[PDB]
Write a protein that binds this DNA or RNA. Structure first.
Lengths: 25, 237, 127, 54, 708
RNA sequence: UUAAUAGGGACGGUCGGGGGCAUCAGUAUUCAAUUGUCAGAGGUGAAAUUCUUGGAUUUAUUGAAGACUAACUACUGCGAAAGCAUUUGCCAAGGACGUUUUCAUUAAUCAAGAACGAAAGUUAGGGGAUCGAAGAUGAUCAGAUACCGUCGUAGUCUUAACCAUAAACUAUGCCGACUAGGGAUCGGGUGGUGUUUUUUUAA
């Protein structure tokens, strides 16, 4: 299960939006 | 006791009149055996006509001697159970369910002044048919033997039983049931036993006594049709 | 042209059952016993009762279409005798006389490898 | 093929027979040591290879 | 999976979006069970929250039998009653959140969640990439077995009849004709096909949703402000078990014609009628004709749509037809009318073998026959061209069979005497077979497949029904003698000898197992036999079968069936074949092993211990062979745990061709959609990259003698 | 000083229905589900209670419970006795055989006392299929079949303790030496031999 959990985290950070564009919009 | 002097019974009070001949509604149904058997024709059965007829057919088990199915008296001492699986146009497609001998030859084979060796194994085929095999073996005296009996020591019995278990497991696991039944008919399994157990001790009357089908997987009509080797109707003009 | 039935014979001490069915055994074709054809209890197991019951089913058998039968005779078995009694053979004899072709004969009496204690007790029974 | 097969087995059986006799002939070294050969052993080359294997 | 919050009645697959996904969470986080108990807890992690909804959606039905109610502003409770449409009622707001969710799409949603739940519960194999990092929405053909484009009439407005069918009542029910017409196609297509299909999707190709500020409604070039679509595409998930049924069963006959019979006779019209069968049942059914070029589904949709939708509609799927034609057409009676799922040619072969099977056994020999095992391609239903009587020009005509006798201690201890002793046994089998059964013809041939074992002689029997069989004898001493040679061989020669042993087990030991699994596994995978045959055809066109062993082509071709994730099991010839090409394109054989569970669809499934053992094997081989020059494809299973049994000896150049050609084929499909021109390219060889090319012609044409 | 045809200990290949703990098979009995059929089923010397038209008895496909190892079973095997008959594993123990290994008299008899101790019985739980003291009930007619039929408590099984009794017999104290032949069996070891086996996996 720990392999999956870390795999979840890698997917979130990879697709996570760059906060700079949040300020821009 | 149908005499008048016979005591009247309570059950006689309510009797269902005979007004309906049972056999007006039963329609004849023909059974066929798998392609592994030489004689596919194995008789016919009867079920009440659909109001269905199919449900009572499925799960029906018929036991028959191989001598009829193989057309040779060498198989008079063996019976095969075949279970209905699919119904098509009164032709009942059956599959192997089990095998045993009759009681008389089993009693004939058991004799005095010798040791009885029986080994059983639970094993599954490559097609997930879980089955149980029973193999029976008997001791024999050599050509020049003078002793009345041919008893074998318990160490031999255990050594033989181990050899019986491994060969039965190996044959079943590395074969399908259709292939397995193809092995049962020529009694090949017994012949590798008597070679395998040749060195440990001389044996006689090597046979696979009983075959039980403990579990079945999901039914596959396509595989069933292949084992037995769809149809358009007729216009009502 | 030859349709095969299954004549199951159960020969007990006090009665004989003649039972004919299909090859599967699921569907009963005709059932008669010694009690059907006799007026006294003492003669239920008599060979005469067996013959009358066997003739009755055989006439019924020729009605239905069945022309041959495979015989599986049996006794009570279990904790009691393992061999069919004279009523069982007499029923077998009548079936031959009815004309139905006999396919194969076998004894299928229940033979326990292990049996519960009989009802007789230590001293015995059937005095 | 029939002739080729027949000759080959005839030669092989003769060689196999000779090999089996050689091992089970009470081999004794020049100094009086009797070699041991187990029953059913057929070739002395086989006996050597067992020693090399083990 | 290509699922969005957009409307689905228009035709686009969707209606379940993030806020459907989230609001299902919140509804479940406050209940969701029939007893109104919480199914999801606030303390759950991301994995558990995702798992619950996937399990919740997969097993509970929200459309036909059962619906869920919750209160946004009160524990959510699952009601058994259903509204016959996807429903998630909100009592607080009186809003059904699944109104945009169509019936047909819901089943595909329910299927997708269930198949993921099986992968989610899987512990043997990691499924993260398949669940989340694999886009199945790229190609419609790979997702959907059959696709049919329907060209509607008069498309600057639809024909007066078609516009008339819309009417006023349906404008109330369905605001736009696109919503109604899509519904019209689904009912007739669903009702016409019935059990022949699992799922159906209707897509309005070329539909726009944004229009300039200067205009009041969307403008389609074909539409002319009237209909916002170019054409309709009918996409199906066929059911292989009954997709090719000749007759569509219907309601039983009755003295009074029942309502289901009423809708029965009207729908198919003249095609509807009454028939009797052997069972004695009298039922209304319509009968179709099988063809080797298109499936039965082709005829049903064309007739069903034309009769009900519009008599001028043009229905065409040529992509199926080209793939069907590429499969060789056998030279048997009624070959053209035979379906591609019919194995009639194959059953005829083993029946002839069964006749020979009985003969060999009753024959008396010095050693009793242990068993005769057929190990052929036609016995496993993978021969490229179906067997044909007397068509001996076919390379696969002579079918290998393994003969084994009772174990004996008299077998020669030397390899050449053993094999010569085998020919002597075969030489008997030829002798009194000729005497007792003169109608059978026989001859002897030499085999050189096993290196350095030149005494192998095989008996070729020409069966009277017109089939050829090759017999080779197997004995227990044969295997250990090869092990003896490896042990005795010099250290430099040992790698060569083990290769000889590898080919021996590939023909004698592992070959028997390969047929046993694949033959049984082939049944429920009805379309595996056509796709592997067509797959084999594709290799031959590109001159790749000479280096690829027949078994490897089967193992690569079965992967979409045993391991369909993230897709479904192939149910059509093109969907399976393109799936095989897709896998080879994206297969990184240097770092990713191929391991298959040759088992039936949900034992013999690979367990954790067996799984890690095979993974350990791949790492060890790649440690010694990182670049993969010696070995390229690592194909393993229970039959082959080593993983090098059927993929050894392939030159590195050829191995790159299979991936290189597969990659370009996928790129070609992306650049240009699946069409007649593209398929013709896929099956024609360039032949220019080769340094030198030599052309050959045989003195006579072999196509007729090949049974084609 | 020997190293008792005294003894103890050791080592090894065996051997055993020797024992304890788990495990597997096995038909049979009873019960339950489904299923085809129908007049009685059962039981005795003969009958009467009893079950049965809500389908009895029997047929067939199964499942559950508790006991228990037929045929192989023998003037054979193990154990101090009482006793011990399915397969597999674990735990400890033991008789006999071989040993050019070992201590050196360590032995025989015997009180109290201690252990085990067939079946039956007592106390407190579990289980309770079959049989079944007791009790209830049907029939009470006929002497070779003359005491049977149904229900059936305690009991029959097991757990933790008591009870310690059998024709528990060679109707027969113990230890040691000597005083006839013959061949059958079982365990072990020795020599020969030729049949079955068999081969560079091991055995």
């Amino acid at each position: 299960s720990n392999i999956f959990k870390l795999q979840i985290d890698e997917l979130l950070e990879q697709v996570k939006l760059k906060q700079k564009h949040v300020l821009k919009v | 006791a149908v005499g008048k002097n016979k005591r009247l019974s309570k059950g006689k009070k309510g009797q269902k009149k005979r007004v309906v001949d049972p056999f007006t509604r039963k329609e004849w149904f023909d059974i066929k055996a798998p392609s592994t058997f030489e004689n596919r024709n194995v008789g016919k059965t009867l079920v009440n006509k659909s109001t269905s007829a199919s449900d009572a057919l499925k799960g029906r088990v018929v036991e028959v001697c191989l001598a009829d199915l193989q057309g040779s008296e060498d198989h008079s001492f063996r019976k095969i159970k075949l279970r209905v699986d699919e119904v098509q146009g009164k032709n009942l497609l059956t599959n192997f369910h089990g095998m045993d001998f009759t009681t008389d030859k089993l009693r004939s084979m058991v004799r005095k002044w010798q040791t009885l060796i029986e080994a059983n194994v639970t094993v599954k085929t490559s097609d997930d048919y879980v089955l149980r095999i029973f193999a029976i073996a008997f001791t024999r005296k050599q050509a020049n033997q003078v002793k009345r009996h041919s008893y074998a020591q318990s160490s031999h019995i255990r050594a033989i039983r181990k050899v019986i278990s491994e060969i039965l497991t190996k044959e079943v696991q590395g074969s399908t049931l259709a292939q397995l039944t193809s092995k049962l008919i020529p009694e090949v399994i017994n012949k590798e036993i008597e070679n395998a157990t040749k060195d440990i001790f001389p044996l006689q009357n090597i046979h696979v006594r009983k075959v039980k089908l403990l579990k079945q997987p999901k039914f596959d009509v396509g595989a069933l049709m292949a084992l037995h080797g769809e149809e358009k109707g007729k216009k009502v003009t | 042209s030859q349709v095969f039935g299954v004549a199951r014979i159960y020969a007990s001490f006090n009665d004989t059952f003649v039972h004919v069915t299909d090859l599967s055994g699921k569907e009963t074709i005709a059932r008669v016993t010694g009690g059907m054809k006799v007026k006294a209890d003492r003669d239920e197991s008599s060979p005469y009762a067996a013959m009358l019951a066997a003739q009755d089913v055989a006439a019924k058998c020729k009605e239905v279409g069945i022309t041959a039968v495979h015989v599986k005779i049996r006794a009570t078995g279990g904790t009691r005798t393992k061999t069919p009694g004279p009523g069982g053979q007499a029923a077998l004899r009548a079936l031959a006389r009815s004309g139905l072709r006999i396919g194969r004969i076998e004894d299928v009496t229940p033979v326990p490898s292990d049996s519960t204690r009989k009802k007789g007790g230590r001293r015995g029974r059937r005095l | 093929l029939k002739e080729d097969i027949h000759t080959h087995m005839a030669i092989f059986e003769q060689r196999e027979a000779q090999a089996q006799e050689d091992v089970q002939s009470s081999i004794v070294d020049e100094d009086g040591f009797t070699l041991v050969v187990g029953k059913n052993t057929k070739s002395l080359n086989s006996i050597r290879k067992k020693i090399l294997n083990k | 999976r290509g699922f969005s919050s957009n409307m689905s009645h228009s035709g686009s697959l969707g209606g379940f979006g993030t806020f459907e996904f989230t609001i299902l969470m919140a509804a479940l986080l406050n209940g969701g069970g029939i007893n109104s108990n919480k199914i999801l807890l606030h303390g759950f992690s991301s994995y558990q929250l995702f798992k619950g909804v996937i399990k919740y959606l997969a097993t509970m039905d929200l459309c036909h039998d059962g619906h869920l109610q919750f209160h946004s502003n009160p524990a959510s409770k699952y009601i058994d009653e259903g509204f016959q449409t996807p429903t998630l009622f909100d009592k607080s707001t009186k809003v059904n959140i699944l109104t945009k969710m169509t019936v047909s799409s819901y089943q595909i949603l329910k299927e997708y969640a269930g198949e993921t739940l099986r992968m989610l519960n899987n512990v043997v194999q990691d499924q993260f990439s398949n669940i989340f990092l694999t886009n199945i929405s790229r190609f419609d053909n790979l997702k959907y077995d059959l696709c049919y484009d329907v060209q509607l009439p008069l498309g600057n407005n639809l024909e007066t009849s078609l516009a008339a069918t819309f009417g006023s009542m349906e404008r109330v029910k369905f605001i736009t004709l696109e919503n109604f017409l899509a519904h019209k196609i689904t009912n007739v297509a669903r009702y016409a096909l019935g059990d022949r299909i699992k799922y159906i999707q209707i897509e309005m190709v070329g539909q726009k949703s944004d229009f300039p500020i200067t205009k009041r409604k969307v403008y389609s070039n074909t539409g002319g402000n009237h209909f916002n679509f170019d054409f309709v595409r009918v996409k199906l998930i066929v059911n292989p078990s009954e997709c090719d049924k000749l007759v569509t069963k219907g309601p039983a006959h009755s003295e009074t014609m029942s309502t289901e019979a009423a809708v029965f006779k009207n729908f198919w019209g003249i095609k509807s009628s009454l028939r009797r069968f052997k069972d004695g049942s009298i039922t209304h059914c319509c009968v179709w004709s099988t063809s080797s070029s298109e499936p039965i589904i082709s005829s049903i949709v064309n007739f069903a749509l034309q009769k009900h939708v519009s008599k001028k509609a043009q229905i065409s799927n040529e992509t199926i037809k080209k793939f069907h034609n590429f499969l060789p057409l056998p030279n048997l009676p009624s070959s053209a009318k035979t379906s591609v799922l019919n194995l009639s040619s194959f059953f005829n072969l083993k029946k002839s073998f069964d006749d020979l099977y009985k003969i060999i056994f009753q024959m008396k020999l010095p050693l009793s026959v242990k068993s005769i095992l057929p190990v052929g391609s036609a016995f496993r239903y993978t021969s490229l061209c179906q067997p044909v009587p007397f068509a001996y020009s076919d390379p696969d005509f002579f079918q290998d069979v393994i003969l084994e006798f009772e174990t004996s201690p008299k077998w020669p201890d030397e390899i050449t005497s053993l094999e010569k002793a085998k020919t002597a046994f075969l030489l008997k089998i030829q002798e009194e077979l000729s005497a007792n059964s003169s109608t059978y013809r026989s001859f002897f041939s030499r085999d050189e497949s096993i290196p350095y074992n030149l005494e192998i002689v095989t008996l070729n029997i020409l069966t009277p029904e017109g089939y050829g069989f090759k017999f080779r004898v197997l004995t227990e001493r044969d295997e250990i003698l090869y092990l003896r040679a490896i042990a005795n061989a010099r250290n430099e020669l040992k790698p060569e000898l083990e290769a000889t042993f590898l080919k021996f087990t590939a023909k004698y030991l592992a070959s028997v197992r390969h047929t046993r699994t694949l033959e049984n596994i082939s049944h429920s995978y009805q379309f595996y036999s056509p796709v592997v045959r067509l797959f084999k055809r594709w290799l031959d066109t590109h001159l790749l079968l000479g280096h690829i062993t027949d078994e490897l082509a089967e193992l690569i071709a079965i992967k979409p069936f045993v391991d369909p994730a993230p897709y479904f099991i192939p149910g059509s010839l093109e969907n399976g074949f393109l799936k095989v090409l897709k896998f080879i394109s994206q297969w990184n054989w240097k770092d990713d092993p191929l391991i298959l569970d040759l088992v039936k669809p949900e034992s013999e499934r690979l367990t954790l211990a067996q799984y890690k053992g095979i993974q350990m094997n791949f790492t060890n081989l790649r440690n010694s062979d990182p670049n993969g020059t010696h070995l390229q494809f690592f194909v393993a299973s229970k039959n082959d745990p080593s993983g090098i049994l059927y993929s050894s000896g392939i030159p590195l150049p050829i191995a790159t061709r299979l991936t290189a050609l597969a990659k370009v084929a996928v790129n070609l499909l992306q650049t240009h959609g699946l069409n007649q021109q593209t398929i013709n390219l896929l099956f024609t060889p360039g032949l220019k990259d080769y340094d030198f090319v030599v052309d050959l012609r045989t003195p006579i044409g072999l196509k007729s003698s090949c049974g084609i």
